[PDB]
């Protein structure tokens, strides 16, 4: 399969009570590895994952020191932004940025990203040609044109090609024993007599790594998804991932709903059936 | 690993 | 790589730069006469060739090779050339040995 | 230019304490200092961004430096060696927020020679 190395920053304008709140977080595929926050105590790069911490000092330098350079810069963007959009100054406003790569099963690059936004909204993102970019409103094109004047794309490039696909490649021939792991779902239902009309049929998968499932449910060979109610894919904490799907069914008829579960570590798409 | 710098918006 | 190089007047002189950092990740050449300040006069961002003008850039980054390639080398191309290297817009740039040019007439 | 450097030649003593300012380019943040005596090439001594330090190299610890709120810097070397005679340059990159314009290139100022003598 294929794998992805992921960084997101969120920078919270706070007037009044500081400067700008700033945390940093690091992700191989599904896993945390990194973090920083802007009120930790240690104001460094952190380790998050057991098979990060081996690096050595000049490693942790490096990205605290990166780290820190990107914290400046989204400072510096939040007042620039706040002025670009005639915002008052005691609102509290958010800028969110994330990039990354992906590589194949092989170690090969596959594809780079780099998305930013403000206040939830997409300002800025890195089109799929690794050569554009794409502007939401007329405050963004002021950005977009001002980076093109700075070769960004080409330096991303550089960056994503280069030293994200060779950490990445690092990342998991360190965390082997984690990373490349497919734990299977584990399946069951739950019955639960809403009225003594209709109960709700609840479809549980537990313990499954990683969180990519699909849970569908039919009635005599169709998907009705008119009451199917999906939820969204939780942590369990260990490092696997929980979902359950439910439905409404006429009490007398449970018999004839399917529950399907299809999952990268299962070699057949299981059904059940209470 | 992180990269290096960015410009400003 | 020190020189001097002794290139004659229209010929094609080639430099070429010792960089000890394997992190870096984009790659210039600056050009420098006796006692002013450097000037950057190339920029390489995609690993191989780039070309501007009469100046070739030259980049591999996994020997760690950077070459400069200046055409028709005129008397007023004699000066020190430098070569330097950052990982991103306001990264920290580390210079390596460069080297003397001198045009003949 | 647009990278001003002061002073341009300075001759001091050993064991003594100098002062170099660097005002950067309209429009610009970042600043690095540099080192080059004849013996290496430049090296990389510093680097701070909008007041705060973003880089530091293979400095001594009798070198301090600092970049104020209105983006000058000052660069303070105590203890002069004879070893210390050099030629330190200030550069400025970083590109301010806005629609300012401008390369996205490191642009050196004029340099500032010091020879420290016995």
């Known amino acids: 399969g294929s794998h992805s190395m992921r960084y997101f920053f969120t920078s919270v304008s706070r007037p009044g009570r500081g400067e700008p709140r700033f945390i940093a977080v690091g992700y191989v595929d599904d896993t945390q590895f990194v973090r920083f926050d802007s009120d930790a105590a240690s104001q460094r790069m952190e380790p998050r994952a057991p098979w990060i911490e081996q690096e050595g000092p000049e490693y942790w330098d490096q990205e605290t020191r990166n780290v820190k350079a990107q914290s400046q810069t989204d400072r510096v963007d939040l007042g620039t932004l706040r002025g670009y959009y005639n915002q008052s100054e005691a609102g509290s406003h958010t800028i969110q940025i994330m990039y990354g790569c992906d590589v194949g099963s092989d170690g090969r690059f596959l594809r780079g990203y780099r998305q930013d936004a403000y206040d939830g909204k997409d300002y800025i993102a890195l089109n799929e040609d690794l050569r554009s970019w794409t502007a939401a409103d007329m405050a963004a094109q002021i950005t977009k044109r001002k980076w093109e004047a700075a070769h960004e794309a080409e330096q991303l490039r550089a960056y994503l090609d280069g030293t994200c696909v060779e950490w990445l490649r690092r990342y998991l021939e360190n965390g082997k024993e984690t990373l490349q792991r497919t734990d299977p779902p584990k399946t069951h239902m739950t019955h639960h007599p809403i009225s003594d009309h209709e109960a709700t049929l609840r479809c549980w998968a537990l313990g499954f790594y990683p969180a990519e499932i699909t849970l569908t449910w039919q009635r005599d060979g169709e998907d009705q998804t008119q009451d199917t109610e999906l939820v969204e894919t939780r942590p369990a904490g260990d490092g696997t991932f929980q979902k359950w799907a439910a439905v409404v069914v006429p009490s007398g008829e449970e018999q004839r709903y399917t529950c399907h579960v299809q999952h990268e570590g299962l070699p057949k798409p299981l059904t059940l059936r209470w | 690993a992180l990269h290096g710098g960015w410009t400003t918006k | 790589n020190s020189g001097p190089l002794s290139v004659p007047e229209g010929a094609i002189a080639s430099l070429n730069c010792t960089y000890s950092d394997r992190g870096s990740q984009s790659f210039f050449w600056y050009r420098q006469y006796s006692g002013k300040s450097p000037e950057l006069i190339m920029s390489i961002y995609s690993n191989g060739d780039k070309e501007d003008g009469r100046f070739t850039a030259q980049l591999n980054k996994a020997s760690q090779y950077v070459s400069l390639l200046i055409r028709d080398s005129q008397p007023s191309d004699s000066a020190t050339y430098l070569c330097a290297g950052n990982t991103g817009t306001a990264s920290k740039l580390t210079f390596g040995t460069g080297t003397r040019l001198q045009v003949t007439l | 230019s647009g990278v001003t450097q002061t002073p341009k030649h300075l001759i001091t003593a050993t064991g003594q304490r100098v002062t170099l300012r660097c005002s950067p380019r309209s429009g610009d943040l970042s600043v690095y200092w540099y080192q080059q005596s004849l013996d290496q090439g430049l090296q990389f001594l510093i680097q701070?961004?909008?007041?705060?330090?973003?880089a530091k190299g293979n400095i001594l610890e009798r070198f301090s430096a600092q970049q104020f709120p209105d983006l000058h810097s000052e660069l303070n070397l105590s203890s002069l060696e004879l070893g210390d005679s050099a030629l330190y340059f200030c550069?400025?990159?970083?590109?301010?927020?806005?629609?300012?314009?401008?390369?996205?290139?490191?642009?050196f100022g004029a340099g500032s020679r010091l020879t420290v003598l016995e």
């Open positions: 701070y961004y909008n007041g705060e330090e973003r």
């Open positions: 550069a400025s990159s970083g590109l301010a927020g806005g629609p300012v314009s401008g390369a996205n290139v490191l642009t």
